[PDB]
Amino acid sequence: GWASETAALSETATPQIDRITIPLHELAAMPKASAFDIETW
Amino acid sequence: GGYLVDPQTSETIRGVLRSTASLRQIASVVNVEATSFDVLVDKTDMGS
């Protein structure tokens, strides 16, 4: 606030915090393989 | 005297110029003697 010359001046305000969670999932692929080098490809 | 005069021919047989844009400049050419050529594509993809 803008304080007055003669006043209380008590406990203006304080930010309320918030925690945002990042669940860190996983992304899975499973293909089967049965010149082409398909293995590396 | 008409037999004594002979016209002079050109130096080279010239022809009509025709365009040389052939889609071979942008497409992909391969040097393949084999009676054919195969290519291998993935019409779809895997899944994750």
User: In this structure, what token pair is assigned to residue B38?
Assistant: 């195969």
Q: Residue B45: closest CA among chain A residues belongs to which residue?
A: A31
Q: How far apart are CA B44 and CA A31, in angstroms?
A: 13
Residue B11 DSSP code: S
Residue A38 DSSP code: T
Residue A7 DSSP code: S
Task: Give the dihedral of Cα atoms B27, B37, A34, B42; nearest 10 deg.
Answer: 20
Question: Is residue A35 within 8 Å of B38, Cβ to Cβ?
Answer: no
| Number of Cβ pairs < 8 A linking chain A and chain B | 7
Chain A contact for B42 (CB, 8 A cutoff)? no
Experimental approach: cryo-EM
Looking up tokens 């016209």 gives B7
Resolution (angstroms) equals 3.4
Residue B47: list chain A partners with CB under 8 A: 29
Listed in sequence order, the residues at least 6 apart from B47 whose beta carbon sits closer than 8 Å to its beta carbon are A29
User: In this structure, what token pair is assigned to residue B18?
Assistant: 């025709």
How far out from the chain centre does Cα B11 lie? 26
